[PDB]
Design an enzyme around this catalytic site. Structure first.
Site, PDB file in Angstrom:
ATOM      1  N   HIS A 142     -72.930 135.607  44.746  1.00  0.00           N
ATOM      2  CA  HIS A 142     -71.856 136.719  44.194  1.00  0.00           C
ATOM      3  C   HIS A 142     -69.938 136.140  43.773  1.00  0.00           C
ATOM      4  O   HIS A 142     -68.953 136.577  42.976  1.00  0.00           O
ATOM      5  CB  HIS A 142     -71.584 137.546  45.594  1.00  0.00           C
ATOM      6  CG  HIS A 142     -70.892 138.235  45.472  1.00  0.00           C
ATOM      7  ND1 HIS A 142     -70.895 139.770  46.078  1.00  0.00           N
ATOM      8  CD2 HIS A 142     -68.978 138.193  46.163  1.00  0.00           C
ATOM      9  CE1 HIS A 142     -70.470 140.266  46.278  1.00  0.00           C
ATOM     10  NE2 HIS A 142     -69.307 139.550  46.040  1.00  0.00           N
ATOM     11  N   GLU A 143     -69.823 134.671  44.475  1.00  0.00           N
ATOM     12  CA  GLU A 143     -68.549 134.242  44.632  1.00  0.00           C
ATOM     13  C   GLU A 143     -68.346 133.484  43.181  1.00  0.00           C
ATOM     14  O   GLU A 143     -67.300 134.146  42.304  1.00  0.00           O
ATOM     15  CB  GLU A 143     -67.683 132.826  45.668  1.00  0.00           C
ATOM     16  CG  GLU A 143     -68.128 134.191  46.989  1.00  0.00           C
ATOM     17  CD  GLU A 143     -67.565 134.654  47.615  1.00  0.00           C
ATOM     18  OE1 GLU A 143     -66.488 135.771  47.159  1.00  0.00           O
ATOM     19  OE2 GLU A 143     -67.940 135.991  48.087  1.00  0.00           O
ATOM     20  N   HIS A 146     -67.812 136.094  40.734  1.00  0.00           N
ATOM     21  CA  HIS A 146     -66.112 136.672  40.566  1.00  0.00           C
ATOM     22  C   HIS A 146     -65.664 135.771  39.080  1.00  0.00           C
ATOM     23  O   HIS A 146     -64.760 136.375  38.529  1.00  0.00           O
ATOM     24  CB  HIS A 146     -65.231 136.818  41.788  1.00  0.00           C
ATOM     25  CG  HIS A 146     -65.431 137.773  42.844  1.00  0.00           C
ATOM     26  ND1 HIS A 146     -65.673 139.533  42.873  1.00  0.00           N
ATOM     27  CD2 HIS A 146     -66.251 137.998  43.364  1.00  0.00           C
ATOM     28  CE1 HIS A 146     -65.678 139.822  43.596  1.00  0.00           C
ATOM     29  NE2 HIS A 146     -66.546 139.004  44.716  1.00  0.00           N
ATOM     30  N   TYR A 157     -59.646 144.723  40.612  1.00  0.00           N
ATOM     31  CA  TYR A 157     -60.171 144.995  42.080  1.00  0.00           C
ATOM     32  C   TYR A 157     -59.093 146.498  42.964  1.00  0.00           C
ATOM     33  O   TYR A 157     -58.870 146.153  43.995  1.00  0.00           O
ATOM     34  CB  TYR A 157     -60.059 143.506  43.052  1.00  0.00           C
ATOM     35  CG  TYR A 157     -60.766 143.619  43.726  1.00  0.00           C
ATOM     36  CD1 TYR A 157     -60.610 142.676  45.355  1.00  0.00           C
ATOM     37  CD2 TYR A 157     -62.372 143.057  42.986  1.00  0.00           C
ATOM     38  CE1 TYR A 157     -61.450 142.545  46.010  1.00  0.00           C
ATOM     39  CE2 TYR A 157     -63.106 142.524  43.952  1.00  0.00           C
ATOM     40  CZ  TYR A 157     -62.573 142.487  45.336  1.00  0.00           C
ATOM     41  OH  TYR A 157     -63.344 142.003  45.882  1.00  0.00           O
ATOM     42  N   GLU A 166     -67.142 144.458  42.097  1.00  0.00           N
ATOM     43  CA  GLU A 166     -68.467 144.151  43.179  1.00  0.00           C
ATOM     44  C   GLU A 166     -69.506 144.088  42.601  1.00  0.00           C
ATOM     45  O   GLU A 166     -70.979 142.974  43.349  1.00  0.00           O
ATOM     46  CB  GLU A 166     -68.106 145.172  44.454  1.00  0.00           C
ATOM     47  CG  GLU A 166     -66.884 144.428  45.511  1.00  0.00           C
ATOM     48  CD  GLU A 166     -67.316 142.413  45.488  1.00  0.00           C
ATOM     49  OE1 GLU A 166     -65.819 142.282  45.894  1.00  0.00           O
ATOM     50  OE2 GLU A 166     -68.150 142.973  46.485  1.00  0.00           O
ATOM     51  N   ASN A 183     -86.983 132.731  49.005  1.00  0.00           N
ATOM     52  CA  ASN A 183     -86.932 134.302  49.568  1.00  0.00           C
ATOM     53  C   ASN A 183     -86.364 135.477  49.026  1.00  0.00           C
ATOM     54  O   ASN A 183     -85.818 136.193  49.934  1.00  0.00           O
ATOM     55  CB  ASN A 183     -86.445 133.987  51.060  1.00  0.00           C
ATOM     56  CG  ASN A 183     -87.413 133.706  51.823  1.00  0.00           C
ATOM     57  OD1 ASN A 183     -88.700 132.882  51.916  1.00  0.00           O
ATOM     58  ND2 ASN A 183     -87.175 135.180  52.540  1.00  0.00           N
ATOM     59  N   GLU A 190     -78.268 138.858  54.079  1.00  0.00           N
ATOM     60  CA  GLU A 190     -79.113 138.423  54.854  1.00  0.00           C
ATOM     61  C   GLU A 190     -79.473 137.001  55.963  1.00  0.00           C
ATOM     62  O   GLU A 190     -79.649 136.687  56.412  1.00  0.00           O
ATOM     63  CB  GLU A 190     -80.326 138.851  54.122  1.00  0.00           C
ATOM     64  CG  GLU A 190     -81.207 138.141  53.776  1.00  0.00           C
ATOM     65  CD  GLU A 190     -80.376 138.132  52.174  1.00  0.00           C
ATOM     66  OE1 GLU A 190     -79.945 138.485  51.576  1.00  0.00           O
ATOM     67  OE2 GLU A 190     -81.129 136.886  51.100  1.00  0.00           O
ATOM     68  N   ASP A 226     -59.887 149.245  52.160  1.00  0.00           N
ATOM     69  CA  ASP A 226     -60.242 148.168  51.711  1.00  0.00           C
ATOM     70  C   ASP A 226     -60.521 148.440  49.737  1.00  0.00           C
ATOM     71  O   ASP A 226     -61.447 148.055  48.728  1.00  0.00           O
ATOM     72  CB  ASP A 226     -62.226 148.582  51.341  1.00  0.00           C
ATOM     73  CG  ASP A 226     -63.142 147.549  50.582  1.00  0.00           C
ATOM     74  OD1 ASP A 226     -62.949 146.438  50.475  1.00  0.00           O
ATOM     75  OD2 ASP A 226     -64.438 147.864  50.207  1.00  0.00           O
ATOM     76  N   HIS A 231     -65.649 147.489  47.769  1.00  0.00           N
ATOM     77  CA  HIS A 231     -66.909 146.440  48.782  1.00  0.00           C
ATOM     78  C   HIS A 231     -67.785 148.270  49.139  1.00  0.00           C
ATOM     79  O   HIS A 231     -69.030 147.720  49.599  1.00  0.00           O
ATOM     80  CB  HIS A 231     -67.661 146.262  50.139  1.00  0.00           C
ATOM     81  CG  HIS A 231     -66.556 144.971  49.321  1.00  0.00           C
ATOM     82  ND1 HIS A 231     -65.135 145.137  49.872  1.00  0.00           N
ATOM     83  CD2 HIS A 231     -66.440 143.218  49.084  1.00  0.00           C
ATOM     84  CE1 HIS A 231     -64.416 143.629  49.403  1.00  0.00           C
ATOM     85  NE2 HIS A 231     -65.811 142.888  48.865  1.00  0.00           N
TER      86      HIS A 231
HETATM   87  C1  LIG Z   1     -67.543 141.551  55.842  1.00  0.00           C
HETATM   88  C2  LIG Z   1     -67.185 140.896  54.874  1.00  0.00           C
HETATM   89  C3  LIG Z   1     -68.548 139.935  54.396  1.00  0.00           C
HETATM   90  C4  LIG Z   1     -67.260 142.178  53.581  1.00  0.00           C
HETATM   91  C5  LIG Z   1     -66.385 142.175  51.769  1.00  0.00           C
HETATM   92  N1  LIG Z   1     -66.454 140.459  51.868  1.00  0.00           N
HETATM   93  C6  LIG Z   1     -67.400 140.575  50.803  1.00  0.00           C
HETATM   94  O1  LIG Z   1     -68.393 141.275  50.092  1.00  0.00           O
HETATM   95  C7  LIG Z   1     -67.998 138.387  49.814  1.00  0.00           C
HETATM   96  C8  LIG Z   1     -68.970 137.975  50.986  1.00  0.00           C
HETATM   97  C9  LIG Z   1     -69.896 138.733  51.052  1.00  0.00           C
HETATM   98  C10 LIG Z   1     -70.856 138.452  50.095  1.00  0.00           C
HETATM   99  C11 LIG Z   1     -70.790 138.140  52.190  1.00  0.00           C
HETATM  100  N2  LIG Z   1     -66.552 138.712  49.741  1.00  0.00           N
HETATM  101  P1  LIG Z   1     -65.671 138.968  48.192  1.00  0.00           P
HETATM  102  O2  LIG Z   1     -65.437 137.802  47.242  1.00  0.00           O
HETATM  103  O3  LIG Z   1     -66.350 140.257  47.829  1.00  0.00           O
HETATM  104  C12 LIG Z   1     -63.996 138.774  48.993  1.00  0.00           C
HETATM  105  N3  LIG Z   1     -63.348 138.407  48.221  1.00  0.00           N
HETATM  106  C13 LIG Z   1     -62.195 139.482  47.989  1.00  0.00           C
HETATM  107  O4  LIG Z   1     -61.276 139.588  48.837  1.00  0.00           O
HETATM  108  O5  LIG Z   1     -61.205 139.044  46.906  1.00  0.00           O
HETATM  109  C14 LIG Z   1     -60.048 139.518  46.887  1.00  0.00           C
HETATM  110  C15 LIG Z   1     -59.015 138.432  46.592  1.00  0.00           C
HETATM  111  C16 LIG Z   1     -58.082 138.040  44.939  1.00  0.00           C
HETATM  112  C17 LIG Z   1     -57.267 137.057  44.817  1.00  0.00           C
HETATM  113  C18 LIG Z   1     -57.199 136.627  45.710  1.00  0.00           C
HETATM  114  C19 LIG Z   1     -57.647 136.408  47.090  1.00  0.00           C
HETATM  115  C20 LIG Z   1     -58.640 137.605  47.467  1.00  0.00           C
HETATM  116  C21 LIG Z   1     -65.044 142.216  52.648  1.00  0.00           C
HETATM  117  O6  LIG Z   1     -64.030 141.153  52.176  1.00  0.00           O
HETATM  118  O7  LIG Z   1     -64.781 143.168  52.460  1.00  0.00           O
HETATM  119 CA   LIG Z   2     -79.095 138.980  60.707  1.00  0.00          CA
HETATM  120 CA   LIG Z   3     -80.185 138.200  49.343  1.00  0.00          CA
HETATM  121 CA   LIG Z   4     -83.223 136.235  50.628  1.00  0.00          CA
HETATM  122 ZN   LIG Z   5     -67.112 139.967  46.235  1.00  0.00          ZN
END
Ligand SMILES: CC(C)C[C@H](NC(=O)[C@H](CC(C)C)NP(=O)(O)CNC(=O)OCc1ccccc1)C(=O)O
Ligand SMILES: [Ca+2]
Ligand SMILES: [Ca+2]
Ligand SMILES: [Ca+2]
Ligand SMILES: [Zn+2]
Ligand SMILES: [Ca+2]
EC number: 3.4.24.27
Length: 316
Positions: A142-143, A146, A157, A166, A183, A190, A226, A231
Site C-alpha cells: 500500500h505504502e 503511494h 490527497y 487510497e 494467505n 488483517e 480525513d 480512507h
Molecule cells: C488507522 C490508520 C492505520 C488508518 C489510515 N492509514 C492507512 O490506511 C495507511 C496504513 C494502513 C494501510 C495500515 N497509511 P497511509 O499511507 O494511508 C497514511 N498516509 C498518510 O496519511 O499520508 C499523508 C502524508 C503526506 C505527506 C507526508 C506525510 C503523510 C489513516 O491514516 O487514517
Molecule cells: Ca485482529
Molecule cells: Ca489482506
Molecule cells: Ca491475508
Molecule cells: Zn494510504
C-alpha cells in the site's frame, strides 16, 4: 554502503523465518544490491528524525525481537519491487530503478505507516490496536504504491482524487498479497491489526460496509475529516474493483468477474496513462473503460464488466 552482496536469515513480525539480501562491509547492512539501485532499511530508534541509521548487524542473523520489523520491511519491499517489475514491467516506483528506502521503529507506540514524499515509515503500533506495521505485506505494498501514484497520475490527497489515491494503494496492496500467495484475501491490514481480535481487519474490499465504509456513491462522506474522507470513500472504488475481479450482484446490478490479473492490468494502465492529479470518480470510470478497451476491444466482456461494476456502486 560499498561492500560484498550476501544473504542473511531472520524472523519476521509474525515469527516466520526468511532470507534477506544484505551487504557486508565490517558489519552486515540491510542493503539489497540485487534490485534496481537498491533497497535500504533504517533504524529510526523510537525517534521521529528520518531516516535514522542504515541498519547494521554484526553477524547476518536477525532473530532478535527488535530486528523483526526491519526484516519484514526489507523483505516485503523486495517482493513489491518484484511484483511491479515482473507483472507490469516497471522498474521501482519511478520506473527508473530509484532506491527504495524504509525506516522502522518510528516514534513510540505509533499506529500508522506512510510514504513521506521520499521514503516509507513504519510505526511499531501500541501493541493492542496494532503490532509493527511492516509485518503486513498488503500494508508494505500500500505504502510503496503511494510512491508509484506520486510518480505517475500524481492524484492530490484530498476529496475524490484522494479517495482514488487510497483505493489504488489498497487494490495493488491486495494484488501484491495474492502475488506472494501469503494467505491472500480482499481485506486490508488483517495480519497486523488488533492482535487480540481474530477475523477483523482495517478495511474490507469485498464488503466495505462491514466497518462502516460506503459501498455506494449515494453513501459518500461529504465532510471534512480525513482529508475529505480519503480512507472512507475509497470503499466505493475498492468494492468496484472487487466486483470486476470476482463478480457478484450488488444493489441488484449483476457483474461477471474477469479475474485479478486483468483487474491489475486495467488499473495499472488507467493509473499510468489516463489519470491526472485532479481526476474524480467519474473520470476514473472513463479511464478504466478506455484501458479495458485498449487492452481487450470495445465489445469485449472485459469492457462490459468494468461498466457493470461502476454502475453497481453508482459511479455514473
Ligand atoms: C488507522 C490508520 C492505520 C488508518 C489510515 N492509514 C492507512 O490506511 C495507511 C496504513 C494502513 C494501510 C495500515 N497509511 P497511509 O499511507 O494511508 C497514511 N498516509 C498518510 O496519511 O499520508 C499523508 C502524508 C503526506 C505527506 C507526508 C506525510 C503523510 C489513516 O491514516 O487514517
Ligand atoms: Ca485482529
Ligand atoms: Ca489482506
Ligand atoms: Ca491475508
Ligand atoms: Zn494510504
Ligand atoms: Ca544479529
Amino acid at each position: 554502503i560499498t561492500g560484498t552482496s550476501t544473504v542473511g536469515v531472520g524472523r519476521g513480525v509474525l515469527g516466520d523465518q526468511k532470507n534477506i539480501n544484505t551487504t557486508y562491509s565490517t558489519y552486515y547492512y540491510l542493503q539489497d544490491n540485487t534490485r534496481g539501485d537498491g533497497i535500504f532499511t533504517y533504524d529510526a530508534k523510537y525517534r521521529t528524525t528520518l531516516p535514522g541509521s542504515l541498519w547494521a548487524d554484526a553477524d547476518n542473523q536477525f532473530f532478535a525481537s527488535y530486528d523483526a520489523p526491519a526484516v519484514d520491511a526489507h523483505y516485503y519491499a523486495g517482493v513489491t519491487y518484484d511484483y511491479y517489475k515482473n507483472v507490469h514491467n516497471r522498474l521501482s516506483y519511478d520506473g527508473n530503478n530509484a532506491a527504495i528506502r524504509s525506516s522502522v521503529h518510528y516514534s513510540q507506540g505509533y499506529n500508522n505507516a506512510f510514504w513521506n514524499g521520499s521514503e516509507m515509515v513504519y510505526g511499531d503500533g501500541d501493541g493492542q490496536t496494532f503490532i509493527p506495521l511492516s509485518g503486513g505485506i498488503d500494508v508494505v505494498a500500500h505504502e510503496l504504491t503511494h510512491a508509484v501514484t506520486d510518480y505517475t497520475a500524481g492524484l492530490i490527497y484530498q476529496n475524490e482524487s484522494g479517495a482514488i489515491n487510497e483505493a489504488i494503494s489498497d487494490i495493488f496492496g491486495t494484488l501484491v498479497e495474492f502475488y506472494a500467495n501469503k494467505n491472500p484475501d480482499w481485506e486490508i491490514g488483517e495480519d497486523v491489526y488488533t492482535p487480540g481480535i481474530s477475523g477483523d481487519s482495517l478495511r474490507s474490499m469485498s464488503d466495505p460496509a462491514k466497518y462502516g465504509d460506503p459501498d455506494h456513491y449515494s453513501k459518500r462522506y461529504t465532510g471534512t475529516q480525513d482529508n475529505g474522507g480519503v480512507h472512507i470513500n475509497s470503499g466505493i472504488i475498492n468494492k468496484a474493483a472487487y466486483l470486476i475481479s470476482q463478480g457478484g450482484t450488488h444493489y441488484g446490478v449483476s457483474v461477471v468477474g474477469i479475474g485479478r490479473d486483468k483487474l491489475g492490468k486495467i488499473f495499472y494502465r488507467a493509473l499510468t496513462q489516463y489519470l491526472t492529479p485532479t481526476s474524480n470518480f467519474s473520470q476514473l470510470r472513463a479511464a478504466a473503460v478506455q484501458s479495458a478497451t485498449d487492452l481487450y476491444g470495445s465489445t469485449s466482456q472485459e469492457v462490459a464488466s468494468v461498466k457493470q461494476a461502476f454502475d453497481a456502486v453508482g459511479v455514473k
